Design a binder for this molecule. Structure first.
Ligand code: AKG
Ligand code: AKG
Ligand code: AKG
Ligand code: AKG
Ligand code: CO
Ligand code: CO
Ligand code: CO
Ligand code: CO
Lengths: 274, 267, 287, 289
């Protein structure tokens, strides 16, 4: 499509794009914002090189995407509670915090101090993962829901490795296996190995073959892109329709990023129509 | 509840010993109906001590459904419905690559080892019934492509009539038994290739899960063969497994096949 | 066999022993034949043996000293005799319904178990057995050479340790003692391949209930090999199936067999009494 | 380290951009030695702005070893040593190399290296994944390493152009691919599971899903779990890099210690690259007896 106010360079044939010709230190006019939002909706993960911005500017940019909440979480930046420090879940493919009834809609991350080489982030499209399934596979699983919890990350199953709050780790939520993105209207797969326990109404054993197949299917290299971080890069990813993977190939070097979270609504099959 | 025969179940899931009946003789209606009841309930049934003839084996078989005049290479001379079986070891049921596989098989031990050569059986009713309602609802409408390609078609030839080996048929994943009215799972690793409409990759995890689920020991029984034992198994709602632990000994049985109707979800 | 009658159950393992009265002391010649049959057939059963507790204990003592198993409740009056019991009304976890051999989380697991039917269903409640000699002997020479030197980490974590506590499938108070979680998590290491101290034969020694990983490997590294061995050892042709009749006594070798409890008797009482004979540390050689 | 070339590593595991060199020209000894160093270290190297001709591509290739064309691929027009990787705008058939593999491991002596040049490539799309089998090997536990180091693996082309290929329906186009012999597709060779690179002296894992059939001496059932585990382990994203192609980019990869993966995310566009293959020696555990 046509971009007049920004320059967009797609990273692959599936997802990811470099956005230039904008200064995120400044407020964005309506026309420029609308192009950024349509690039976000199309490309699903977008990155802005060369944006030496402040905390308030990071927060204000984030707010264009949706609400960002006065969080004061343990890793909140002092004086700027909407920004968290990320200093280095992780190295399995996932999307963030799917154990919540309403996970983030997006995340906006800024490199503060990063390696010259190493520390890439993989991304993939769950739209493409869904669309490459056969019509029969689609019809078979489209109505299923999946139980998500943090039990293997900070709940009882985690604790039971022998060598946050445990109740909060164990609390289950249920999301559709196939979700409709509230902004693009597109269907995407919604499952991940970090937080998904089982299909709602099935046993774990019953669920395992299907979940394992979907994990392997979604993560084929051709559904993926790889983002390199440079100092002052801003990355925004769609937390509903992508998954990501943190690459730890920079042993012994400092990696510091700041993060804001944009709030979403309950993942759903639709937002009041089909 | 059985007045004309004596029935001793082999396990809590399937299999039963039937005594108090002489298969040399014609069966009156009341006795036949009890045998058919026992067959429908226990799914694999065995009659010890039945020193019968070929025509008697054939006539007993005909009570279950049609048995076809057509000889095979292994037909007994003079008795083309009876075949000699002389000696499998994956769980299967027979000939599911056909549009209409056998409904049942009636096998008679002629000369068999004193120990060794058991046959495992399992119930696909119980395999189906131990799946959660949600798993059931999710897969009940699927159909499965069966062929003999890995037994005597192109895939077999590539690792070791080929057109007949490759010919595909489709059966429901879940079938209703035409006599009992019960639903059972219908899949096996020997002949099932993929789920109709799905790729192989899509299909394999679900098929492998169902194969592993159906073959848990508690869904199973084990039949020992004795001279003159007659065994009948339901070829739709059971699977079986040939145990080869009798290296170097003669094992001869006779078999008749009872014809069935196309496996289906409803009649 | 001159003193006993032995009827093998299959071509791989299992035999019926008759012509013996276990109410009586056994002369040397008869005992030696029973031991021969045990070593050969690996699981042996004696049909019509309406014996008392002292007699069960005395028969057990011929195999080795009595060393009770941690998890099971003792019968009233006899600490060496333990229950396997399930009630008509019970719906909780069934004791033994994955392939295993007993208590492999111990440094020195039982050598053998002698179990007697007290009150059992007319049909239902069989026990599966398999031979780990045969499991080992059907591996290719190259597979054998590849894994013969490996050891395996065993623990009870999924039965009464932290992983058990973390899940919902729960044992009944009926046959099973209250237990310590640290003792459930405690690791022991055994060889993957063991030499039976009585027969001198090599057998595979791994089971899905108690084995966590191969010593020195990660769980991920271990899983393919362990899963392959579990599937390989449990093929039906390596197996037999024992039916219980009232007063049948069964003896199994706890080192070279595995067993499987079949629960196809929902709604019926099943009671058996059991004595456990102590063994020594599993090892690759006894020289 | 580098005085004659500029080297920019792509990731912390493998891959590097090489600039400050003109591949139209012969390379002096000092410059070649640095390129070879970089190749040995980074395992896949790429040279962005190299509008070279066929003779120059061939002459650069010869610095790595002699030219030994790969069985499957079609030669270009005036040059039998230069082969096409090509997919047309229109094409819907099997894509060349869309499983992780290294090339032609069914040969007793597979290629040591490949040098590939972009002729006409999409503006976005058609990346190639690479990974390091040194790093795959080195992240296995010492005990796992000791357990499998002595195994050998049977390779053949049966699923690419032998009987198993003929028995299935997913078909290559006539476009980049020669008509092939089924017996040659089925012919087995055996390589060690762990190989020593003859130039770097480093051990790397040597297994791939395209050509490996079983472990020598084992049944298929015995072999499958180990091979599947190694395939999954070697292809973790952190062992990988992703190379984007620009027109006139020259890429050289080590065919012994890397694997690669062709990404097909450019449905409806032409992609043409030209390739020369450098011959290598029998993979082996040691080059010192
Ligand atoms: O460090 C990164 O690139 C992203 C890490 C991650 O998994 C997250 O914060 O969601
Ligand atoms: O042991 C048996 O009689 C069953 C033989 C068999 O498996 C077959 O009918 O294909
Ligand atoms: O109940 C049975 O059949 C055997 C249970 C068991 O595993 C045991 O007693 O060790
Ligand atoms: O097309 C590509 O990206 C590489 C394909 C491949 O495997 C090859 O050229 O050997
Ligand atoms: Co994350
Ligand atoms: Co059969
Ligand atoms: Co037990
Ligand atoms: Co290739």
């Amino acid at each position: 499509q046509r971009f007049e106010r920004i320059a967009v360079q797609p990273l692959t044939g599936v997802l990811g794009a470099e956005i230039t010709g904008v200064d995120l230190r400044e407020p964005l006019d309506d026309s420029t914002w609308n192009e950024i939002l349509d690039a976000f909706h199309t490309y699903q993960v977008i990155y802005f090189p060369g944006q030496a911005i402040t905390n308030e500017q990071h927060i204000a940019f984030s707010r264009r995407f949706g609400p960002v909440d006065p969080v004061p979480l343990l890793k909140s930046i002092e004086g700027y509670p909407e920004v968290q420090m990320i200093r280095r879940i992780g190295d399995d493919w996932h999307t963030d915090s799917t154990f919540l009834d309403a996970p983030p809609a997006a995340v906006v991350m800024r490199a503060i101090d990063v390696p010259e080489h190493g520390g890439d982030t993989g991304f993939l499209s769950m739209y493409t993962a869904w669309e490459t399934l056969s019509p029969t596979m689609q019809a078979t699983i489209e109505g299923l829901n999946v139980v998500h919890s943090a039990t293997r990350v900070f709940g009882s199953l985690y604790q039971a490795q022998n060598r946050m709050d445990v109740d909060a780790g164990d609390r289950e939520t249920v999301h559709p296996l196939v979700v409709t993105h509230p902004g693009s209207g597109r269907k995407g797969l919604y499952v991940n190995q970090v937080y998904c326990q089982r299909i709602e109404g099935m046993s774990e054993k019953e669920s395992e073959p299907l979940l394992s197949f979907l994990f392997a299917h979604a993560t084929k290299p051709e559904f993926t892109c790889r983002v390199r971080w440079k100092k002052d890069q801003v990355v925004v990813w769609d937390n509903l329709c992508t998954m990501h993977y943190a690459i730890n190939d920079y042993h012994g070097q400092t990696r510091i990023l700041h993060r804001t979270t944009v709030g979403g609504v309950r993942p759903a099959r639709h937002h009041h129509h089909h």
